[PDB]
Scaffold this motif. Structure first.
Motif, PDB file in Angstrom:
ATOM      1  N   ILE A 118      68.308 -95.107   6.888  1.00 40.21           N
ATOM      2  CA  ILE A 118      67.702 -93.809   7.385  1.00 40.21           C
ATOM      3  C   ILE A 118      67.410 -93.073   6.759  1.00 40.21           C
ATOM      4  CG2 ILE A 118      68.157 -92.178   9.295  1.00 40.21           C
ATOM      5  CD1 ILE A 118      70.491 -93.895  10.339  1.00 40.21           C
ATOM      6  N   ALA A 119      66.206 -92.112   6.821  1.00 44.54           N
ATOM      7  CA  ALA A 119      65.674 -91.364   6.090  1.00 44.54           C
ATOM      8  C   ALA A 119      66.649 -89.823   5.747  1.00 44.54           C
ATOM      9  CB  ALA A 119      64.102 -90.649   6.591  1.00 44.54           C
ATOM     10  N   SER A 120      66.808 -89.967   4.714  1.00 45.61           N
ATOM     11  CA  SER A 120      67.806 -88.852   4.607  1.00 45.61           C
ATOM     12  C   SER A 120      67.652 -87.259   5.307  1.00 45.61           C
ATOM     13  CB  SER A 120      67.934 -88.246   2.975  1.00 45.61           C
ATOM     14  OG  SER A 120      68.653 -89.477   2.410  1.00 45.61           O
ATOM     15  N   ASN A 121      66.656 -87.141   5.707  1.00 44.49           N
ATOM     16  CA  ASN A 121      66.469 -85.898   6.603  1.00 44.49           C
ATOM     17  C   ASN A 121      66.361 -86.182   8.079  1.00 44.49           C
ATOM     18  OD1 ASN A 121      63.655 -86.301   6.482  1.00 44.49           O
ATOM     19  ND2 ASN A 121      63.239 -84.892   5.078  1.00 44.49           N
ATOM     20  N   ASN A 122      66.531 -87.453   8.626  1.00 42.89           N
ATOM     21  CA  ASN A 122      66.425 -87.645   9.928  1.00 42.89           C
ATOM     22  C   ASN A 122      67.967 -87.590  10.696  1.00 42.89           C
ATOM     23  OD1 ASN A 122      66.202 -88.528  12.646  1.00 42.89           O
ATOM     24  ND2 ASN A 122      65.001 -90.053  12.183  1.00 42.89           N
ATOM     25  N   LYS A 141      67.875 -92.484  -3.411  1.00 48.91           N
ATOM     26  CA  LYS A 141      66.963 -91.737  -3.875  1.00 48.91           C
ATOM     27  C   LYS A 141      65.681 -92.555  -4.037  1.00 48.91           C
ATOM     28  CE  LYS A 141      68.187 -89.208  -7.893  1.00 48.91           C
ATOM     29  NZ  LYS A 141      68.600 -90.547  -8.524  1.00 48.91           N
ATOM     30  N   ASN A 142      64.449 -92.022  -3.282  1.00 47.85           N
ATOM     31  CA  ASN A 142      63.340 -92.462  -3.375  1.00 47.85           C
ATOM     32  C   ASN A 142      63.166 -93.902  -3.082  1.00 47.85           C
ATOM     33  OD1 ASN A 142      63.538 -91.434  -6.733  1.00 47.85           O
ATOM     34  ND2 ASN A 142      62.619 -90.108  -5.127  1.00 47.85           N
ATOM     35  N   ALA A 143      64.021 -94.259  -1.821  1.00 48.39           N
ATOM     36  CA  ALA A 143      63.947 -95.378  -1.107  1.00 48.39           C
ATOM     37  C   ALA A 143      62.430 -95.732  -0.567  1.00 48.39           C
ATOM     38  CB  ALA A 143      64.982 -95.279  -0.057  1.00 48.39           C
ATOM     39  N   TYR A 150      57.830 -88.792  -1.790  1.00 49.15           N
ATOM     40  CA  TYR A 150      58.980 -89.796  -1.907  1.00 49.15           C
ATOM     41  C   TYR A 150      59.808 -89.344  -0.906  1.00 49.15           C
ATOM     42  CZ  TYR A 150      57.548 -91.809  -6.297  1.00 49.15           C
ATOM     43  OH  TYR A 150      56.878 -92.287  -7.480  1.00 49.15           O
ATOM     44  N   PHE A 151      60.756 -90.425  -0.324  1.00 51.19           N
ATOM     45  CA  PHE A 151      61.927 -90.223   0.668  1.00 51.19           C
ATOM     46  C   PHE A 151      62.950 -90.836   0.408  1.00 51.19           C
ATOM     47  CE2 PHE A 151      57.839 -89.879   2.371  1.00 51.19           C
ATOM     48  CZ  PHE A 151      57.753 -88.376   2.964  1.00 51.19           C
ATOM     49  N   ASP A 152      64.345 -90.021   0.208  1.00 47.21           N
ATOM     50  CA  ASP A 152      65.614 -90.756   0.088  1.00 47.21           C
ATOM     51  C   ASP A 152      66.024 -91.366   1.472  1.00 47.21           C
ATOM     52  OD1 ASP A 152      65.565 -89.550  -2.421  1.00 47.21           O
ATOM     53  OD2 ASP A 152      66.672 -87.731  -1.913  1.00 47.21           O
ATOM     54  N   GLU A 153      66.991 -92.256   1.168  1.00 46.63           N
ATOM     55  CA  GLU A 153      67.560 -93.012   2.610  1.00 46.63           C
ATOM     56  C   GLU A 153      68.970 -93.185   2.409  1.00 46.63           C
ATOM     57  OE1 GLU A 153      63.690 -95.424   4.301  1.00 46.63           O
ATOM     58  OE2 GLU A 153      65.484 -96.540   3.340  1.00 46.63           O
TER      59      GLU A 153
ATOM     60  N   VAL B  75      56.025-101.958   4.671  1.00 42.53           N
ATOM     61  CA  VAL B  75      55.051-100.767   4.507  1.00 42.53           C
ATOM     62  C   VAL B  75      55.049 -99.639   3.326  1.00 42.53           C
ATOM     63  CG1 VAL B  75      53.754-101.330   6.659  1.00 42.53           C
ATOM     64  CG2 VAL B  75      55.899-100.013   6.642  1.00 42.53           C
ATOM     65  N   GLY B  76      56.514 -99.211   3.268  1.00 40.18           N
ATOM     66  CA  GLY B  76      56.506 -98.002   2.323  1.00 40.18           C
ATOM     67  C   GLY B  76      57.589 -98.247   1.148  1.00 40.18           C
ATOM     68  N   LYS B  77      57.563 -99.499   0.990  1.00 39.61           N
ATOM     69  CA  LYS B  77      58.553-100.008   0.074  1.00 39.61           C
ATOM     70  C   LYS B  77      57.943-100.788  -1.197  1.00 39.61           C
ATOM     71  CE  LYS B  77      63.170-100.503   1.851  1.00 39.61           C
ATOM     72  NZ  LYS B  77      63.885-101.684   1.967  1.00 39.61           N
ATOM     73  N   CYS B  78      56.884-100.772  -1.447  1.00 41.11           N
ATOM     74  CA  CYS B  78      55.989-101.402  -2.317  1.00 41.11           C
ATOM     75  C   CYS B  78      56.160-101.134  -3.821  1.00 41.11           C
ATOM     76  CB  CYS B  78      54.575-101.152  -1.967  1.00 41.11           C
ATOM     77  SG  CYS B  78      53.787-102.200  -0.773  1.00 41.11           S
ATOM     78  N   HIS B  79      56.818 -99.980  -4.085  1.00 46.07           N
ATOM     79  CA  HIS B  79      56.902 -99.246  -5.272  1.00 46.07           C
ATOM     80  C   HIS B  79      58.220-100.239  -5.816  1.00 46.07           C
ATOM     81  CE1 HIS B  79      59.231 -96.592  -2.677  1.00 46.07           C
ATOM     82  NE2 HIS B  79      59.959 -96.674  -3.464  1.00 46.07           N
TER      83      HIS B  79
END
Lengths: 164, 162
Positions: A118-122, A141-143, A150-153, B75-79
């Protein structure tokens, strides 16, 4: 009125539910903007034995949705990931009923543990899944990267065994 | 000496031979070999899965070490990408070190910014080794793996090519 396994007969309903069911955060908007209809048709088929989208139905209308992706990889079949939880109107009574169905199915496939990222800010989502019985596993970090943003999870885990 | 390259369907025999040596310290080579299917091996080796690549090190024409790079084509995980099935004849560290360097350089060419690998929990040689290439512990996975009715804890290590 109940929950069944979605299939390639529901592709239609499944885009519509995607169009506004989770059209909340920018993640949810970007997914729509750039995801393939191939992978979907793939997932929706039963030859993808371990890649399962479930749907909750009010009459003709698909109302909630969630994917179960079991890890068909050597030594990893006891585990599975929950992904792409789309709900219409954000009816939680309904989603809670959906997550439960998916848990019962997991048990019945001998899947021992469930994970969700889950995205850290959901925070609504952390609270929801947490209220179901998921617990913190890891923090990444930067999941997820979108554009160049970027977004943490937070990775949560639920165990389907009477452990304790 | 050496040569490092992409493995193809033609290297399947060699790669099967490498696993058969039983040199993996926590027996993953036997576990994997006992439980895997050749279709999936062939699927990994294939041209047609270009985000999923096995690299090999050779001494002459001898496949002497291996490690797979699996990019996340979600989709958002390619890096991101995972290193898996790091098999090394003799646990030869100088060889394995050239291999990981090559894979890192190759990852950089794909715009991969982060790599991850699962390591057996009690494997402190591997933690030392990856630690010296720059990997640090990201998390501990209790019952990460099951084979038969045996469990195994793993730690995920992570490295930033950034």
């Amino acid at each position: 009125n109940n929950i069944r396994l979605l299939n390639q007969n529901d592709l239609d309903s499944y885009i519509e539910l995607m169009k506004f069911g989770h059209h909340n955060y920018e993640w949810d908007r970007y997914y729509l903007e750039n995801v393939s209809i191939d992978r979907l048709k793939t997932i929706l088929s039963n030859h993808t034995d371990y890649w399962n989208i479930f749907g909750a139905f009010e009459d003709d209308e698909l109302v909630a949705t969630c994917t179960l992706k079991q890890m068909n990889y050597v030594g990893k079949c006891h585990k599975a990931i929950l992904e792409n939880n789309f709900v219409k109107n954000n009816d939680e009574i309904v989603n809670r009923e959906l997550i439960n169905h998916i848990i019962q199915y997991a048990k019945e496939q001998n899947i021992e543990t469930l994970m969700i990222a889950i995205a850290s800010n959901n925070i609504s989502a952390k609270v929801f899944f947490s209220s179901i019985g998921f617990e913190n596993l890891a923090f990444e970090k930067n999941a997820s990267k979108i554009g160049n943003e970027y977004f943490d999870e937070n990775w949560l885990i639920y165990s389907t065994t009477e452990s304790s």
